[PDB]
Amino acid sequence: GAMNSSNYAELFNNDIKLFVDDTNVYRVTVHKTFEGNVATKAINGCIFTLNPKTGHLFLKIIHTSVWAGQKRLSQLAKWKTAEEVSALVRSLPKEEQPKQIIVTRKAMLDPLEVHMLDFPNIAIRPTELRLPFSAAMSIDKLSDVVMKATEPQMVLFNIYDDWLDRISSYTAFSRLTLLLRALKTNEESAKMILLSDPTITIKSYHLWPSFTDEQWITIESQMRDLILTEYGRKYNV
């Protein structure tokens, strides 16, 4: 079945599962041609495949060459996502293959399902949650590796840095989604909040700053306030 607020804690049990977010797979800029018509230019993209229990991120970089000479690219992008996810599963040892894959957008169900026909016991699921995974390219280190890539490439990250050394998966995921929610609603402020203090740095092998426990509390409160402000502005409440 679909994933929603009721069955939310299932993400943190011991059944291996992956979220797949395809929002950044096919990325364009829109511009005017010399004759005044509109054309698109593709830039590099990424499939965002995340184990929400362990933090392991499977960042499959989608090089613009993938699109060359192809039509209906937004539809193709869904099939290339499904192809790349299927190949990821096949590449993993049996005991590491997921029991479920949750697609953040319902348009991926058919492509993934068709691509996973070899894995009948892997359940493909939609979600009613409104996960902010499209803000993944607001994370500087992820945006940088995608934009610099010169060929298809898989890059592996732990999106939780070392957080699990001190907090649970459940809490880890709520921090991640709150950070990314903030980044989505107002990137400029969100990024300001994370870096205002030069003395708190990002380890070379990490994505986020090395806040102490007490500093994460001030951060999470700052991100909360950001989200609610932007809401009043959006709707005039």
């Binding site: 099939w79 499904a82 492509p111 068709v114 026909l117 070899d118």
Partner: protein
């Protein structure tokens, strides 16, 4: 012209023969249907005045033997049987006609409806879908489930229609995942036509037989099968021109023949709007589209 006599009619029943039907009263002296046109399959079907549930009936072809109906008070329904004694059967049939206790198969001479609904249906294929090889006719009813329905219980009573499933290894070549799922041409032409059905006529025949079981018995898995087979064709970029033209004729008479009041459960909204308006063959069903619009514009 052939005859199916009835030993008696002990219970109030609506009898159908093909697209015709008659009300028969309890212990009314009804003794059969005459002038049944040779050369086609037929179906004789029943709905008791007391149980508007369970429509049931018998597919048959009179070239394959002498058949008659007899009520069975133990099982509570009209049974088809075969009389092996040719002489003994002509005797019953002639005396009943002499006594004029038989209705005449009421074919208007202008009317090709039944031929059009059954063009490609052959008794031999029916008996493979309804396996009961000791009888030469086939029983079907409202509640019988299909083989595919059963996979998702009793196999003696299954409708062994050809399983179609768009999200299956059979349908999708490895490496052509996207291609084959958007363009089912491979699945239609190679897997189904050349592989399983062997030619388009056996495919049309199953399609039509499925439709008629849905119309006559409200058999819900039959409706599913009919829709699946239409969808497979309409979702294929590459179909022989002769199949498209015949398909438009097949579907026209099926839509023409459907009871106006049943269009809500027999017609799948998604399939028909996809076939007529989104699919590769949106432009190849001019008669089917014209009749659908003028008769069921709401469903669309």
């Amino acid at each position: 012209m052939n005859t199916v006599p009835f030993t008696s009619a002990p219970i109030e029943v609506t009898i159908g023969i093909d697209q015709y039907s008659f009300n028969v009263k309890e212990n009314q002296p009804f003794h059969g249907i005459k002038d049944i046109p040779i050369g086609h399959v037929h179906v004789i079907h029943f709905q008791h005045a007391d149980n508007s549930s369970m429509r049931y009936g018998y597919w048959f072809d009179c070239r394959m033997g002498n058949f008659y109906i007899q009520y069975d008070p133990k099982d509570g329904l009209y049974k088809m049987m075969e009389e092996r004694d040719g002489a003994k059967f002509e005797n019953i049939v002639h005396n009943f006609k002499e006594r004029q206790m038989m209705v005449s198969y009421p074919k208007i001479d202008e009317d090709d409806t039944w031929y059009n609904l059954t063009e490609f249906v052959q008794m031999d294929k029916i008996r493979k879908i309804v396996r009961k090889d000791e009888n030469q006719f086939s029983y079907v009813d409202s509640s019988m489930t299909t083989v595919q329905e059963n996979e998702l219980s009793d196999p003696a009573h299954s409708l062994n229609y050809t399983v179609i499933n768009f999200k299956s290894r059979e349908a999708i070549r490895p490496g052509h995942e996207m291609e084959d799922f958007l363009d089912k041409s491979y699945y239609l032409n190679t897997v189904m036509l050349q592989g399983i059905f062997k030619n388009s006529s056996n495919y049309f025949g199953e399609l039509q037989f499925a439709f008629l079981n849905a119309m006559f018995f409200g058999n819900y898995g039959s409706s599913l099968q009919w829709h699946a087979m239409i969808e497979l064709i309409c979702s294929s970029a590459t179909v022989p021109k002769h199949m498209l033209d015949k398909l438009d004729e097949i579907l026209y008479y099926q839509i023409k023949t459907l009871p106006e009041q049943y269009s809500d459960i027999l017609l799948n909204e998604r399939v028909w709007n996809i076939c007529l308006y989104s699919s590769f063959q949106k432009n190849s069903l001019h008669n089917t589209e014209k009749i659908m619009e003028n008769k069921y514009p709401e469903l669309l």
